[model samples]
Target: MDFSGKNVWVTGAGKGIGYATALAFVEAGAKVTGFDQAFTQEQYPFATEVMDVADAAQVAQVCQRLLAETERLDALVNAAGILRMGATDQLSKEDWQQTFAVNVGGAFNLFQQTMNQFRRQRGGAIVTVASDAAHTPRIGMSAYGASKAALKSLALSVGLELAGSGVRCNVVSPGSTRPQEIANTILFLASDLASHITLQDIVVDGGSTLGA
Candidate 1:
């Protein structure tokens, strides 16, 4: 409950679940760092990294710089994502590319950094924002859904790869079917509630994607 000295770095903290996640950790007494294209730091007591998560170079420099100063990245929460809805036939290549760039590439870039961090520390947690659309795919969401599917796979595989280091990597899917419902899920994953869990893509959608 008291995250007093922990550092929780979250992407997409500019709004919605990401924003709420940052706020929640701060309330629970942890230092928060955020990654986003844009943000207003005045609303909370956390640092912001203003850059696209899809850019590996930028993320590397900034994260390394932060780790040098803070010396630890206690938790990594990836909530940054985009949605450009259209039927597969109507979707443009640009839409699909951008969707995967942010949703898939973004999460992996951060994971690569923190995976190493936790490995050094021999312990850490990673919670990625995936979607229910991945498992329950539909016609109108090819770009978004496919990106999420890949992200789910990426998180699970990494979770398995890092199990030996005592690092926990997992995916939190959109079971609540609402935007804000995701923040608390991230909090739970980052917290001790799910400590015995790893290499798993857990759906927190309030059972909407149920009975399948």
Candidate 2:
């Protein structure tokens, strides 16, 4: 359905899945706010803020500002992520740190801030974009996979915490889904059809994880 007058915020909205999700929300009659490291109003046309999710302080500040401006939030989508390729033996500390910062920390920061808003408003929805790596790790993906696995755990914990508050938390674990594929899934998750679903990780991997 119709999300008319709803306020939706998406992280990593500068491009790819984030951008597509923001656009889809707007088309579905929602007022959208995009959070990213780099974006222009002219290019996005929807309201956008240059906030890096990797920076906890910045995320908090931006969340507070948005709360003050909107007074309420309907949906929050954490789609910020980073990918680093390396086997466990070849992974560096820097690579692990960076991957965790973006993939896990960013989502946690946004989830915490958004949970606060949901508590104040008494109801809201949260959808996090995780990865198939969370469930099944592969070669040359130690850091990245670990980060995603942690993300899944974090979402589960937070979802349990908010279970009775009308605040829903869920994870969308995508595998090999290009930008367009992710866009479609995000739209469905934000729709009314997914109202009863929360704290669940929906994988969109085209059966790649299915074992023979």
Which prediction has the highest TM-score against the true structure? Answer: 2
TM-score for every candidate vs. truth? Answer: 0.93, 0.93
Runs in model 2 lying further than 4 Å from the true structure: 40-42
Cand. 1 TM to true fold: 0.93
Per-residue lDDT over 16-105 for candidate 1, one digit per residue giving the tens place of the 0 to 100 score: 778888888888999998789777656656777786789988888887788778777778888899988899989998998999999999
Best by lDDT: 2
lDDT of 2: 0.83
Error of 2 at 106 (Å): 0.4
Write out the backbone clash pairs for model 1. Answer: 175-205, 176-205
Question: What TM-score should be assigned to candidate 2?
Answer: 0.93
